[PDB]
Amino acid sequence: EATAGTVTVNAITSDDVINASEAAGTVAVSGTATGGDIAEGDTVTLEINGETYTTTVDANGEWSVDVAGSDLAADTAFDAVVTSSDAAGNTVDTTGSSTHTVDTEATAGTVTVNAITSDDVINASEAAGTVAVSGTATGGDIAEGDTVTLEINGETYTTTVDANGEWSVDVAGSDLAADTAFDAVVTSSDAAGNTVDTTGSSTHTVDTEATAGTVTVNAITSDDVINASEAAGTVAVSGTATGGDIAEGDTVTLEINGETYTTTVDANGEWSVDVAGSDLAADTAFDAVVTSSDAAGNTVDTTGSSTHTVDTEATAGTVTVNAITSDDVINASEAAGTVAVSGTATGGDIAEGDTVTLEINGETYTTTVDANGEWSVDVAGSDLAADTAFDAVVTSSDAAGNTVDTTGSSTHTVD
Ligand SMILES: [Ca+2]
Ligand SMILES: [Ca+2]
Ligand SMILES: [Ca+2]
Ligand SMILES: [Ca+2]
Ligand SMILES: [Ca+2]
Ligand SMILES: [Ca+2]
Ligand SMILES: [Ca+2]
Ligand SMILES: [Ca+2]
Ligand SMILES: [Ca+2]
Ligand SMILES: [Ca+2]
Ligand SMILES: [Ca+2]
Ligand SMILES: [Ca+2]
Ligand SMILES: [Ca+2]
Ligand SMILES: [Ca+2]
Ligand SMILES: [Ca+2]
Ligand SMILES: [Ca+2]
Ligand SMILES: [Ca+2]
Ligand SMILES: [Ca+2]
Ligand SMILES: [Ca+2]
Ligand SMILES: [Ca+2]
Ligand SMILES: [Ca+2]
Ligand SMILES: [Ca+2]
Ligand SMILES: [Ca+2]
Ligand SMILES: [Ca+2]
Ligand SMILES: [Ca+2]
């Protein structure tokens, strides 16, 4: 008889595992054959998934044969048999045996993209800066450290899946302002070298500006004029604010004589704020600015503007009293009758029709300034007989409503 040797089979591929790519092509199965009657040229036979493969032992005790990966994927064990002869021509089979494993599939998982910024809207501030785009990746062969790729506005951003299945990557807001749809692809692999991609989709919106409205300012006081009395107290400056993104509670800011005043737009599109007359007396124009924001948090100022007029003084004139009777003496027949006491009132804001008031002997006489700047009033002679000194006071006002008194004095004698 002939004598068997030793046959061995090397790993099936470098890791002894058949993956997808290997299973799809051809695999060199190799090994050794020596000892006994094994000689160069002895045929090596392998049956693998029912297919008979054959090669011959080379000159160094080695053999190799190309096997279809599909047969190795289907059959995880096989003998390799070398057939030999001794010189006498007895025959003998030497067997070596092989095992391997098969894994021809990686498993995708699940990938998601979170809202793009807290509100899934890119605003103006966000477009101008850096936004962190985040999400999840979990399931199947997705593991910590797998690559995440996002293409956004033609820019390729990458990160890696963290230990918790989340991922984040800093992205330019510009890019997000310009491209409102994209995918995150996560690429995973298994021990065997199989690879798989898992995709998640994201959309968002862009809104970079908030819309101004219309702001108006009412008259400054009833007549749009600041008088002295008004300048000395407080004035309610009011108006309206509506349209665009203006809403109740939006701040209204007015600067007037360098003082900053603020209130808030009420529920009816109206506003009001107490301003010191003195600032209004000092500064005859101002803007009222309402600061608003849209849903996305863009902000906008709406301006309305005010003018007004200022007049805080009346001007006193000149008042005189004529001689009391032609000779400036009250006689007995004058005392017994009525005397016309007369004079002038002119200058400043004194005007035709201004009130003239005389108190003589406790009795109050009044008349008005005529067209010529003179005045006269009939007075009891007895009163002039009883009181030899008195004032005439003329009360005048201006258009703004300031008022002034002008006084002239008189004395006379009695006989
Ligand atoms: Ca023999
Ligand atoms: Ca392999
Ligand atoms: Ca068979
Ligand atoms: Ca050969
Ligand atoms: Ca088998
Ligand atoms: Ca066997
Ligand atoms: Ca032989
Ligand atoms: Ca093996
Ligand atoms: Ca697998
Ligand atoms: Ca946002
Ligand atoms: Ca890309
Ligand atoms: Ca896109
Ligand atoms: Ca892996
Ligand atoms: Ca979204
Ligand atoms: Ca907007
Ligand atoms: Ca006024
Ligand atoms: Ca001003
Ligand atoms: Ca302005
Ligand atoms: Ca708002
Ligand atoms: Ca005005
Ligand atoms: Ca005046
Ligand atoms: Ca007289
Ligand atoms: Ca008197
Ligand atoms: Ca007047
Ligand atoms: Ca006199």
Residue numbers in the entry: 2 to 416
From the manuscript:
A 1.5-MDa RTX adhesin [MpAFP (Marinomonas primoryensis antifreeze protein)] with ice-binding activity was found on the surface of the Gram-negative bacterium, Marinomonas primoryensis, from Antarctica. RII consists of approximately 120 tandem copies of a perfect 104-aa repeat that account for over 90% of the mass of the 1.5-MDa protein. We hypothesized that MpAFP_RII serves as a Ca2+-dependent extender domain to project the ice-binding RIV away from other cell surface molecules in order to bind M. primoryensis to ice.
The crystal structure of the RII tetra-tandemer from MpAFP was solved to a resolution of 1.8 Å by the molecular replacement method using the RII-tandemer (PDB: 4 KDV) as the search model. The RII tetra-tandemer is roughly 190 Å long and 23×28 Å in cross-section. There are 104 Ca2+ ions bound to the four RII tetra-tandemers within the unit cell of the crystal, with a minimum of 24 Ca2+ binding to each tetra-tandemer binding. Each individual 104-aa repeat of the RII tetra-tandemer folds as a Ca2+-dependent Ig-like β-sandwich that contains seven antiparallel and two short parallel β-strands, and two short α-helices. Seven β-strands (β1–β6 and β9) and the two α-helices (α1 and 2) help form the compact core region of the Ig-like domain, whereas β7 and β8 comprise a β-hairpin that protrudes from the core, and points toward the N-terminal end of the structure. The four tandem Ig-like β-sandwiches of the RII tetra-tandemer are aligned in a highly extended fashion. Each repeat is rotated by approximately 90° relative to its neighbour(s), forming an internal 4-fold symmetry within the RII tetra-tandemer. Ca2+ ions are also coordinated at the linker regions between the neighbouring repeats. Furthermore, evaluation of the atomic structure with the solution scattering data using CRYSOL also yields a good fit, corroborating that the crystal structure is representative of the structure of the protein in solution.
